[PDB]
Design an enzyme around this catalytic site. Sequence first.
Site, PDB file in Angstrom:
ATOM      1  N   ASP A 129       0.852  -1.233  -0.042  1.00 36.36           N
ATOM      2  CA  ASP A 129      -0.276  -0.004  -0.080  1.00 36.36           C
ATOM      3  C   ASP A 129       0.723   1.311   0.091  1.00 36.36           C
ATOM      4  O   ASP A 129       0.222   2.512   0.148  1.00 36.36           O
ATOM      5  CB  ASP A 129      -0.964   0.080   1.316  1.00 36.36           C
ATOM      6  CG  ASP A 129      -1.936   1.213   1.097  1.00 36.36           C
ATOM      7  OD1 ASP A 129      -2.251   1.608   0.065  1.00 36.36           O
ATOM      8  OD2 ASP A 129      -2.611   1.581   2.306  1.00 36.36           O
ATOM      9  N   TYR A 134      -9.122  -3.423  11.314  1.00 36.91           N
ATOM     10  CA  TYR A 134      -9.710  -2.491  10.708  1.00 36.91           C
ATOM     11  C   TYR A 134     -11.151  -2.640  10.808  1.00 36.91           C
ATOM     12  O   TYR A 134     -11.957  -2.449   9.927  1.00 36.91           O
ATOM     13  CB  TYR A 134      -9.193  -2.115   9.241  1.00 36.91           C
ATOM     14  CG  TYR A 134      -8.065  -1.752   9.266  1.00 36.91           C
ATOM     15  CD1 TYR A 134      -6.681  -2.685   9.217  1.00 36.91           C
ATOM     16  CD2 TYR A 134      -7.362  -0.392   9.394  1.00 36.91           C
ATOM     17  CE1 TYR A 134      -5.562  -2.291   9.076  1.00 36.91           C
ATOM     18  CE2 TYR A 134      -6.255   0.188   9.200  1.00 36.91           C
ATOM     19  CZ  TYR A 134      -5.273  -0.792   9.219  1.00 36.91           C
ATOM     20  OH  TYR A 134      -3.925  -0.492   8.887  1.00 36.91           O
ATOM     21  N   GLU A 153       1.617  -9.081   7.137  1.00 39.43           N
ATOM     22  CA  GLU A 153       0.361  -9.319   6.651  1.00 39.43           C
ATOM     23  C   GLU A 153       0.445 -10.367   5.208  1.00 39.43           C
ATOM     24  O   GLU A 153      -0.262  -9.864   4.543  1.00 39.43           O
ATOM     25  CB  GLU A 153      -0.555  -8.141   6.330  1.00 39.43           C
ATOM     26  CG  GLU A 153      -0.953  -7.054   7.549  1.00 39.43           C
ATOM     27  CD  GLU A 153      -1.851  -6.123   7.330  1.00 39.43           C
ATOM     28  OE1 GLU A 153      -2.681  -5.791   7.965  1.00 39.43           O
ATOM     29  OE2 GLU A 153      -1.899  -5.542   6.268  1.00 39.43           O
ATOM     30  N   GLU A 201      -1.376  -2.020  13.736  1.00 45.18           N
ATOM     31  CA  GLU A 201      -2.156  -1.203  12.783  1.00 45.18           C
ATOM     32  C   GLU A 201      -3.375  -0.884  13.318  1.00 45.18           C
ATOM     33  O   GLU A 201      -4.135  -1.908  13.033  1.00 45.18           O
ATOM     34  CB  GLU A 201      -1.954  -1.742  11.338  1.00 45.18           C
ATOM     35  CG  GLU A 201      -0.853  -1.446  10.685  1.00 45.18           C
ATOM     36  CD  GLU A 201      -0.599  -1.887   9.291  1.00 45.18           C
ATOM     37  OE1 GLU A 201       0.379  -2.144   8.824  1.00 45.18           O
ATOM     38  OE2 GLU A 201      -1.565  -1.821   8.536  1.00 45.18           O
TER      39      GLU A 201
HETATM   40  O1  LIG Z   1      -4.713  -0.164   4.202  1.00 46.74           O
HETATM   41  C1  LIG Z   1      -4.175   0.099   4.854  1.00 46.74           C
HETATM   42  O2  LIG Z   1      -3.962   1.655   5.205  1.00 46.74           O
HETATM   43  C2  LIG Z   1      -2.940  -0.595   5.566  1.00 46.74           C
HETATM   44  C3  LIG Z   1      -3.452  -1.951   5.743  1.00 46.74           C
HETATM   45  N1  LIG Z   1      -2.449  -2.570   6.114  1.00 46.74           N
HETATM   46  C4  LIG Z   1      -1.275  -2.756   5.558  1.00 46.74           C
HETATM   47  C5  LIG Z   1      -0.603  -1.337   5.347  1.00 46.74           C
HETATM   48  O3  LIG Z   1       0.484  -1.459   4.426  1.00 46.74           O
HETATM   49  C6  LIG Z   1      -1.832  -0.467   4.813  1.00 46.74           C
HETATM   50  O4  LIG Z   1      -1.472   0.986   4.738  1.00 46.74           O
END
Ligand SMILES: O=C(O)[C@H]1CNC[C@@H](O)[C@@H]1O
Lengths: 602, 599
Positions: A164, A469, A414, A505
């Site tokens: 990403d 998330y 991941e 994250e």
């Molecule tokens: O989608 C996203 O904002 C994050 C999800 N996990 C991996 C990250 O590289 C990514 O930036």
Amino acid sequence: HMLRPVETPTREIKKLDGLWAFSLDRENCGIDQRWWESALQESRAIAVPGSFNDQFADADIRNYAGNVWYQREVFIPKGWAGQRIVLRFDAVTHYGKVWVNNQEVMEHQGGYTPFEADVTPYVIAGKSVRITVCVNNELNWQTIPPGMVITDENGKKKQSYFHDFFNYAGIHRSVMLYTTPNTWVDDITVVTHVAQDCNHASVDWQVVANGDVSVELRDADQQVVATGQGTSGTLQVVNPHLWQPGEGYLYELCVTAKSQTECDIYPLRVGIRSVAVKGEQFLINHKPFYFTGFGRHEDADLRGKGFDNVLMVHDHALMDWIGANSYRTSHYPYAEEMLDWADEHGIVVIDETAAVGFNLSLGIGFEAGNKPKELYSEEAVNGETQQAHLQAIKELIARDKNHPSVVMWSIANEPDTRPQGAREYFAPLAEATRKLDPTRPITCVNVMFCDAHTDTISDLFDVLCLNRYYGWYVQSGDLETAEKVLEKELLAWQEKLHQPIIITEYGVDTLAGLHSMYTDMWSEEYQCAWLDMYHRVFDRVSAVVGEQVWNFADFATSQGILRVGGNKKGIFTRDRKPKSAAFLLQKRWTGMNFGEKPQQGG
Amino acid sequence: HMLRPVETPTREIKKLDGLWAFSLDRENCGIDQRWWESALQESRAIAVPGSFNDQFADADIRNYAGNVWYQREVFIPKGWAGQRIVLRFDAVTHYGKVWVNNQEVMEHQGGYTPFEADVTPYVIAGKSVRITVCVNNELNWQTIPPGMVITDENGKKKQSYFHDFFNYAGIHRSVMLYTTPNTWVDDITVVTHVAQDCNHASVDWQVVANGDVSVELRDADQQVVATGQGTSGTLQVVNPHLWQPGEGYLYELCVTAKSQTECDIYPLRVGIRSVAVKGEQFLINHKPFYFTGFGRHEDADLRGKGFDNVLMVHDHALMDWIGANSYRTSHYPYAEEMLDWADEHGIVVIDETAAVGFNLSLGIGFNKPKELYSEEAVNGETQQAHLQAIKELIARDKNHPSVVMWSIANEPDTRPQGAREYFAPLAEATRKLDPTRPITCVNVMFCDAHTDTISDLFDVLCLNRYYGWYVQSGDLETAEKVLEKELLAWQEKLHQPIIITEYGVDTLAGLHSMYTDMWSEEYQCAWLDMYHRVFDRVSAVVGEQVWNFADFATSQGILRVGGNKKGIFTRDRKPKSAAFLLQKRWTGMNFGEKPQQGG
Ligand SMILES: O=C(O)[C@H]1CNC[C@@H](O)[C@@H]1O
Ligand SMILES: O=C(O)[C@H]1CNC[C@@H](O)[C@@H]1O
């Protein structure tokens, strides 16, 4: 063998002068017609360090896939007669090949760790020497990170990849020529053992090339506290000042390399500190620690991933202000200046390899072809992807082995661990990493859709690192349902593994300036509510020993209907301005006592 | 049968004015304890017209699914002793049921068309009367649009749906009480035929209940140009002033209802113009027309889909400025005031039913079913609800000269067989109910020419393409080659007129980029211009309507940055720098005339 260049009876000429000559090679004939032999033709000025993409404000240089040519002349000092001369590139992103006046001296694939070559036999002290570098920015299934170079019908290549962040390339950190005597310390390893905070043993081992060694350990007052002899097998007994999160007291290890005729002295900074995973606790110097802070990126506005000193001082000012005590080198090894800073100021750091995108189930990345039907196969992520991955783990450990601020190695970020063969791939590199560095715990960062019922490889590691998330990519907008899914998932993970759990994250995309009375996705009010709901869940699950907000700052991604001019989950904007959530985190992280988990109250 | 109320010896008191009492019904006990018998307990002031969702800056009202209660008092005018009195709601979005002091008078499903009822035996002139309305916003598979209410593990409703605009609900348009003599014209139909614009004919057919009537045609000067008579419909023919997309000249046909004791006069506006599809050309009074304009939405900031006059006048000033001569009433019937404005100023309208979201293959809206066309979901019952929507759309807009074409549905998935079993009868019944206008169905991107099954059943080809956005993202040159190859593939397959009814890219106002990359205002400009240089070299293209005149609100998603951002203007109507691009093109053109592969 890797050492940070230092200046002690040793000298360096920083060749970072920027303003190198720069040229693309769209016809791919630079290797053919021997471009290193004469001055680059139809070149332009390029700054080094710095990615080449955003520097000229032109999309066709930005999205170029192939070889780029850097060139520079440099006068080599007279007074380096009897000295050994070494040309070093602290990072050439992806692939780099160098010529010293029609002679190739080095070659490296791996965009984030240093490589060097001994240049003495092709250099004359006092004469000007021309340095040509061929850099490649392509990723295949055996590069780290992987990717797929896609040729159209006319030979123009488009890089697709699966992570990403934007694939900035070029010469990203500092290029130098440094000296050394012909007897020299080539490698130092230091291990520090702690026994309830009153007396400890610093195992030393040194690979000097060409001399006997004495060692001497000096404190912050430069007074000698311990001496030792022998190429290795030095263990010194102290009554110590521990390296602690917050202060970062650093002793100094002076390694002497004395031959008959010459002498060489190398000062290595040593932090006295023990890290251990015991139960569901991550103990630093035998005390339970609570991580706070960020996943970061080496990302800025016009230098791309180019290192920069103002940018490093300012971002540490902000990370100190907001109350963060930790971060993760998100998705690649960082510059060593960053980890040297963490050493001085007692910042806890999770170190990470570049192995991101071992997953073809995310909309993340660039999608300019067709992804393979099985990730762990001979066509993609094979035995050589595994060897490249091992190689990246060894170079990473070989550079940061003695940094006391590094508390964990991240083997990958991941990966998709549902397919059988994910464990056939990851088990060997997990044991090989533990054999490379057995003094630090080991982790792999786990993707959201590999829940506790589905993940196959997390039991091979010491600490569980989660990226979640809920309420964003799933249960979108629904905070009350998300709270239930997250608490159910975290309690399941704790019960199945009984490991410590760090959330590495968690964040949501947030337009700076978009405000909502309904706390909607993409608003600053949503970011705040979402972060605070996550924080109430953490504080109710004992196995959670860390929280790391997904990104510190907005950063560039490849184009896609999911990425409004980049990824916007930052707490700060790209030019480092705080979103509303920045004051949310500051009140939490400075309201807790340092390094300790909030006891679900305040 | 329905008519828009006017006022020459027919009367009106618009109860639209102002604040009604409003209360949610989270326990679903309004009907149980019969809330229409008393004043709403624990009510709060709400505005009509207006969506209830955004009026209160409350997330729990905005995302409510269930029943909501409007209530109001009103004094019935005394001069209405012997008149017959009608209660007309011109739109109650999705479902409404009305009580007029403990007597239920009417009830309607379908959130964008008017419904009325005779209320005489339940009022007496001179007294205050209580009006309660129970409004519902649930969508299931037999509603137009379809949807899917999912109930949680214990209690709460959450509504899922498959269209890309927020599911605003409530009393969205005017509520009015109007009178009428006890002998009255119930419905008027007018159809107009031209040949070579020199002397032409107004075929009349009308239903006047309760008496025999005069029918008289005056022009803009109130001069009588022809009188003809009967009770049912017979033709009229004199030398005309054609209703043209440039000007919009309107004759007027008065219908005068003669009974023994009473008489009633209805004034109807009539624009004399033909429409015909011939070869690859869309002819308005026998000259090819080239459409320019927008897919629009009824979407303003704090009112949701509530109609508003200031917003109507301003948006038309903006469409007048930018040079558009047309628009499409995207994804539901619009307020009739829009189509009367289109009558007066000669704006060409593509009128459309609420038949949106007949597709489970998009990532827009919202355990979805396996097959679209089956018993679970879209069945025979949905086909009749769909037909009923067509019945009252046409019955509402048949007399408008500006409604040039009907759109039966928006981006349905026509790949699973049964799509043709479903859509063949709908096309033929729609032609049965109005054969004066061509009919279309607007076609989704992923159902290109070699996949789609029902392009044959319609007179013009409507396309929504987003090459360079949703596919080949950012690649303007590959998108050009896909887009132009397809546009010619379609024309060889069908030799139909091709109106591109949707093309646009999301664009955040203020985002600028020296690289011409997605989400920037520059990308919006380059992308639009490339689509334009593809249109001008394809002979069969009859119209361009960029996807959306203005940013609008959708349901929450990772694909929608605080709404859908494909607008040419922002939500408050400020122009992104692509508005100047389109004004250059649409005003440099000759009016309604195609650019000839250049400038
Ligand atoms: O989608 C996203 O904002 C994050 C999800 N996990 C991996 C990250 O590289 C990514 O930036
Ligand atoms: O995705 C989009 O932006 C558009 C695609 N076609 C249909 C529209 O309702 C929708 O808004």
